[PDB]
Write a protein that binds this ligand. Sequence first.
Ligand SMILES: O=C([O-])COc1ccc(N2C(=O)CCC2=O)cc1
Ligand SMILES: *[C@@H]1O[C@H](CO)[C@@H](O)[C@H](O)[C@H]1NC(C)=O
Length: 338
Amino acid sequence: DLRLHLLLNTSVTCNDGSPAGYYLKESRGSRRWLLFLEGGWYCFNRENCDSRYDTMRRLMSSRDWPRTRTGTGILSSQPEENPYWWNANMVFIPYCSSDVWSGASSKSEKNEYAFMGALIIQEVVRELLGRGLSGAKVLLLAGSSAGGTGVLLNVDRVAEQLEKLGYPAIQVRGLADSGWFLDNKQYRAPTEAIRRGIRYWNGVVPERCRRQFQEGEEWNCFFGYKVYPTLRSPVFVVQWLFDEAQLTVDNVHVQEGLRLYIQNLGRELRHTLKDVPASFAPACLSHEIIIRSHWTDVQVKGTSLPRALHCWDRSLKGCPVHLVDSCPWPHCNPSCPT
Ligand SMILES: O=C([O-])COc1ccc(N2C(=O)CCC2=O)cc1
Ligand SMILES: *[C@@H]1O[C@H](CO)[C@@H](O)[C@H](O)[C@H]1NC(C)=O
């Protein structure tokens, strides 16, 4: 179990003004720290956020959070379930800001909701320094789905934070799971919903990316193949070639026209990963992987995801780090989740 701690700085809040927080289990012999960002879509205006508040309240408030969570997958402490970092200090950061971890706006007298995802990450890092993060050698910022996009948006800022707080020896890395999306044509739009949300949230993006696209176009930095080339921290990219959330925003739910659409989507995703040296991209129709119990089951070209992450650690013979399937249809890889 990971144990819940609400933030001591109570000005850093979930959407409804309740304090944000994090679930913690320490490993007191270890200098590795894993900080995982939860996913769960987003909301982009008053009416859309009101609907989320009625049926997805735990993603907008801490008032009903349980006091513990079980660590699973890469947050598991058991070597058989987690061959990669079973001995690490484990942190689960709940997603309660509905802003793809990009917001920096408080609830005030003209804002019904607070959108503080970017400040929540940085406040968690500050408060962990006094619980042993100050002696860390590696901080891996990981995340799934919207949390995976949040890794891309925040990994460099965490490295900047620690560099200016006096900790230049902590190596900050990112692990982005299922957050690598394409702004492609639909089969029958997500791009304003993001452009509209950024305005609603006062959302922020990495600097080098923001300076490339400039004002009014920062929505581009939410797409992995556009923001990743601007990043300075090492980032490992895990991405199903046929991600379920991608097909959803593409209005896909088999005749020739759909067949060609699905094959073209797989080919384009493969192309955007050509120059990403650390990546794992199986030809499956699925969604998320790193915190699920059977995450050691999938293999690409004979190598599992926990092995590929270990090989990434060594890189920073027979221990590859760039694993992208080349077959063009969902589940042509026999190890796909069933
Ligand atoms: O399950 C989940 O959390 C899925 O959430 C998502 C959050 C954001 C996006 N998205 C971007 O980041 C850019 C374009 C786009 O649509 C997609 C899914
Ligand atoms: C609490 O968090 C807010 C928002 O990040 C920040 O402005 C403020 O300085 C913090 N307070 C303390 C005491 O660190």
